[PDB]
Design a protein around this ligand. Sequence first.
Ligand SMILES: *[C@@H]1O[C@H](CO)[C@@H](O[C@@H]2O[C@H](CO)[C@@H](O)[C@H](O)[C@H]2NC(C)=O)[C@H](O)[C@H]1NC(C)=O
Ligand SMILES: *[C@@H]1O[C@H](CO)[C@@H](O[C@@H]2O[C@H](CO)[C@@H](O)[C@H](O)[C@H]2NC(C)=O)[C@H](O)[C@H]1NC(C)=O
Ligand SMILES: *[C@@H]1O[C@H](CO)[C@@H](O[C@@H]2O[C@H](CO)[C@@H](O)[C@H](O)[C@H]2NC(C)=O)[C@H](O)[C@H]1NC(C)=O
Ligand SMILES: *[C@@H]1O[C@H](CO)[C@@H](O[C@@H]2O[C@H](CO)[C@@H](O)[C@H](O)[C@H]2NC(C)=O)[C@H](O)[C@H]1NC(C)=O
Ligand code: NAG
Ligand code: NAG
Ligand code: NAG
Lengths: 312, 223, 73
Amino acid sequence: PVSMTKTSVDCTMYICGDSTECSNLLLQYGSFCTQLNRALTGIAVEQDKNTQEVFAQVKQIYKTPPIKDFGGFNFSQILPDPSKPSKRSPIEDLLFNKVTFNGLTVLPPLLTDEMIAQYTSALLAGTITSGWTFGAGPALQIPFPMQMAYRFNGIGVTQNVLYENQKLIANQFNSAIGKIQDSLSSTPSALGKLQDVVNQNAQALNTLVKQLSSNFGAISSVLNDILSRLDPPEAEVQIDRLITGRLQSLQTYVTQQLIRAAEIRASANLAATKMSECVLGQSKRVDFCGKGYHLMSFPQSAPHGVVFLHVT
Amino acid sequence: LIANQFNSAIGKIQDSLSSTPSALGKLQDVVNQNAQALNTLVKQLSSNFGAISSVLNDILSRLDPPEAEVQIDRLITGRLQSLQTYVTQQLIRAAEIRASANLAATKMSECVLGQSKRVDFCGKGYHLMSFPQSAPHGVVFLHVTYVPAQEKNFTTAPAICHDGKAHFPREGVFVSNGTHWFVTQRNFYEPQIITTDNTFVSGNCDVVIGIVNNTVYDPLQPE
Amino acid sequence: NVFQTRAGCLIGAEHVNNSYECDIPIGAGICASYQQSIIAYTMSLGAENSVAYSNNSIAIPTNFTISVTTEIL
Ligand SMILES: *[C@@H]1O[C@H](CO)[C@@H](O[C@@H]2O[C@H](CO)[C@@H](O)[C@H](O)[C@H]2NC(C)=O)[C@H](O)[C@H]1NC(C)=O
Ligand SMILES: *[C@@H]1O[C@H](CO)[C@@H](O[C@@H]2O[C@H](CO)[C@@H](O)[C@H](O)[C@H]2NC(C)=O)[C@H](O)[C@H]1NC(C)=O
Ligand SMILES: *[C@@H]1O[C@H](CO)[C@@H](O[C@@H]2O[C@H](CO)[C@@H](O)[C@H](O)[C@H]2NC(C)=O)[C@H](O)[C@H]1NC(C)=O
Ligand SMILES: *[C@@H]1O[C@H](CO)[C@@H](O[C@@H]2O[C@H](CO)[C@@H](O)[C@H](O)[C@H]2NC(C)=O)[C@H](O)[C@H]1NC(C)=O
Ligand SMILES: *[C@@H]1O[C@H](CO)[C@@H](O)[C@H](O)[C@H]1NC(C)=O
Ligand SMILES: *[C@@H]1O[C@H](CO)[C@@H](O)[C@H](O)[C@H]1NC(C)=O
Ligand SMILES: *[C@@H]1O[C@H](CO)[C@@H](O)[C@H](O)[C@H]1NC(C)=O
């Protein structure tokens, strides 16, 4: 996971609805509403920073040549598909298909899904056509078999091993790629990690909304009923109890969101490190870029996340 | 040339730091967040929270304990909630700062005390070294890196066929300038004559795809 | 004048058809900047580039630059 849904809750409208008496009573507590709005805004900005750090690591937007022949390696399952009206690779399409008021608003992300798809396409094109050079300066073209010979030499295997089995290795690579697309389609629990974030945020919002129907000791959970059944001198007490309960509920939601945002940002920093090391280069770190000796990686965009295909 | 480039880079870095006031925005953000949290905590002292007055002295000097107890209790509840909120926010921000400090310590251990092969961990490019610098409530790393430039265009071959044997480059890569073939290191164009001491033999010229015919110099034939 | 974005309704910004880097993030790929008035446009992800790739061509650097960068933590 890279980022979560950017939510913003109006403290005044949530606590008091559209009642001026409740707003005047709410002003007695100081600047609680300002703090809550500020914290939610900070989380919302941090989500855009997470997505920018993960995907926006290259300056240029590289493109693959129209004639796609890389010595037998077949990247059709990860390169963008122009036939679909989404410019997504088939695996990206499968990933996007597997994942399923009261002052509450959902701010759209700064980067559209098409923009993240373009960043992923640029990374894939750069890796395919220039190896790891484009991540440390100018993009230097190199035949893909020669690049894979370099990566074979990087794990203690002489490059003559690759060439003498070139058409064999390509076959294995292609087969492995195909199997990935099958497994994701046959397993509904493959993308559980992203679904956990989605479910947690949705359930937190549902509980926050459901807290509006609690009496909290007042005669009713509807503010308009209290206003329409009583006059201010003793309606103020009931409204005060409702204000205290709703304010505590909003405070709990804000604290939970801050903790979960810290967790999500930690995961986003890990994803950025893996994009810098596994994708833009070859890593000698054990188990950092998958089981075995790392050869290369391919990033793929996913709804609120990133999927790495580690070739080892 | 390398010494001149290093000195020019250091001078440019100093000039960029001096001329840009927003360069050190991270530390300023931390300081502003802490100061603003303190200001909000202090400002919370002036809220009634439902009591007749926000000053304890007024309630003490105006009301007897039996009825002033309610006002003091309301003020206590409000101020306690404000302080708890402040402490929770401080704990979260302290965790954030601890994570940042752990990352800074890792960067100091791996970029400064040694040379790191991790990509983009110690600056853009091929990391050469790093220099630490103290900053108020922070650290600034000067990542010195090697950036290749002025690339040029070449015809390459996976191996060289000679005497019915395939020769692969021992360390570099085979290149062609149009008519002749040389072998050069991958990160710098230093062409050299393809000999038997910079290539190794493996198999014949039938398996490799893209092999080309060329002559491999032997340092023993002259003698 | 009036511009409708996926992030709402923007008033007072003249929608501009050219793309630049993001200055003030509006949302949904829309960014606003001051040129002299306020313009709203679609953010640009970077300069277009297509490195010439062929099965027997390699590009090798011939000379180099030593670059120093700052990182603040
Ligand atoms: C690259 O791999 C893809 C895998 O889909 C191949 O595309 C399929 O090719 C078969 C014929 O071999 C067609 O029946 C399918 O409809 C194709 N699928 C798609 C999505 O186009 C593709 O041919 C491979 N490329 C090469 C050069 O072998
Ligand atoms: C490719 O490199 C070869 C080898 O350096 C060049 O051949 C040399 O050319 C110069 C200038 O004409 C002569 O003085 C040398 O005697 C040649 N050396 C040899 C060993 O024959 C060749 O000109 C280069 N080709 C191109 C197109 O740059
Ligand atoms: C590279 O040289 C080899 C010989 O060293 C060439 O192989 C010859 O190819 C011809 C034409 O097919 C055959 O009649 C000969 O019998 C082959 N000779 C040997 C020794 O096998 C090869 O064709 C050359 N490659 C290129 C691209 O010209
Ligand atoms: C590598 O690039 C450097 C610049 O970083 C070149 O240095 C310049 O060389 C020219 C030609 O003599 C001089 O006019 C400049 O004053 C030099 N600049 C500096 C900063 O010293 C260097 O020549 C390049 N090397 C090659 C082989 O092209
Ligand atoms: C190498 O040749 C290609 C041929 O299309 C050209 O476009 C490219 O710019 C060349 N590279 C350099 C560095 O001159
Ligand atoms: C490169 O492609 C050409 C066709 O454009 C083909 O004739 C040649 O054999 C290929 N070379 C290699 C090394 O694959
Ligand atoms: C942008 O180009 C479109 C064509 O799709 C044109 O209709 C529109 O007027 C253009 N907008 C501006 C501001 O030039």
